[PDB]
Write a protein that binds this ligand. Sequence first.
Ligand SMILES: *C(=O)c1ccc(O[C@@H]2O[C@H](CO)[C@H](O)[C@H](O)[C@H]2O)cc1
Ligand SMILES: *C(=O)c1ccc(O[C@@H]2O[C@H](CO)[C@H](O)[C@H](O)[C@H]2O)cc1
Ligand SMILES: [Ca+2]
Ligand SMILES: [Ca+2]
Lengths: 121, 121
Amino acid sequence: AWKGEVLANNEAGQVTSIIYNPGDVITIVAAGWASYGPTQKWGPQGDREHPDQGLICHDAFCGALVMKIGNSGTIPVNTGLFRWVAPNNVQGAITLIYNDVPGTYGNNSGSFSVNIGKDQS
Amino acid sequence: AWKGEVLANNEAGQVTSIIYNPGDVITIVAAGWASYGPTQKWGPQGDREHPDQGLICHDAFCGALVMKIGNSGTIPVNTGLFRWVAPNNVQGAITLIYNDVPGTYGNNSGSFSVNIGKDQS
Ligand SMILES: *C(=O)c1ccc(O[C@@H]2O[C@H](CO)[C@H](O)[C@H](O)[C@H]2O)cc1
Ligand SMILES: *C(=O)c1ccc(O[C@@H]2O[C@H](CO)[C@H](O)[C@H](O)[C@H]2O)cc1
Ligand SMILES: [Ca+2]
Ligand SMILES: [Ca+2]
């Protein structure tokens, strides 16, 4: 299992120790407060009121937690995933990323604390 | 394992099928959007800007997810718990509740989708 912080201003994302292999079942729980710029902060589901101005993940709100697995596109994580299995052909190291517009991470603040484990399968 | 919705306007709380027994390790993931009255909505961590005006749980924000185990006091859940063990002497059915001021649940709306499972131990 892995536990760590994902900083909102980390554009490259936080690489975890989890290698997702075909058939793996995983659970993620994410908590905390972060901002993409405004004084307010939002949880891991991001800001449901903010328009998408070119986010790295179009299937989650600005300020949400998302992930990539190996060479995958971004996949929404939000508050987490419960005994979740990846789509076919998705595999590799899990990187966690704050959802923002590329090039605009400099003014971000806060972080999410995240646990990832592999479940029985 | 249990999956269900917890309505924000449900003052008594949502009883789950989970009975927490001594030694149990559990994982909870909570998602979704709800309100304690305003037109806006918040995630399972609630509204970090709203003062505590007499919440059923003083250790979580208004609009956060909390729980009771048997006849325990409220315990914060927020976005969830990862491989969590209860304090000594705490056991019984898990009830999930929206954190609001007693008697003020009538104007609440929305719900959280919640998964609870027992982990290997
Ligand atoms: C309203 O016009 C408005 C409020 C805040 C805001 O913040 C920017 O959002 C961008 C992503 O959409 C990016 O994160 C910038 O760094 C933020 O300052 C934009 C617009
Ligand atoms: C101040 O701007 C303000 C005060 C209260 C409020 O909503 C009420 O919050 C209560 C809990 O603190 C309770 O949930 C009531 O039902 C709400 O109407 C909004 C804004
Ligand atoms: Ca930004
Ligand atoms: Ca209310």
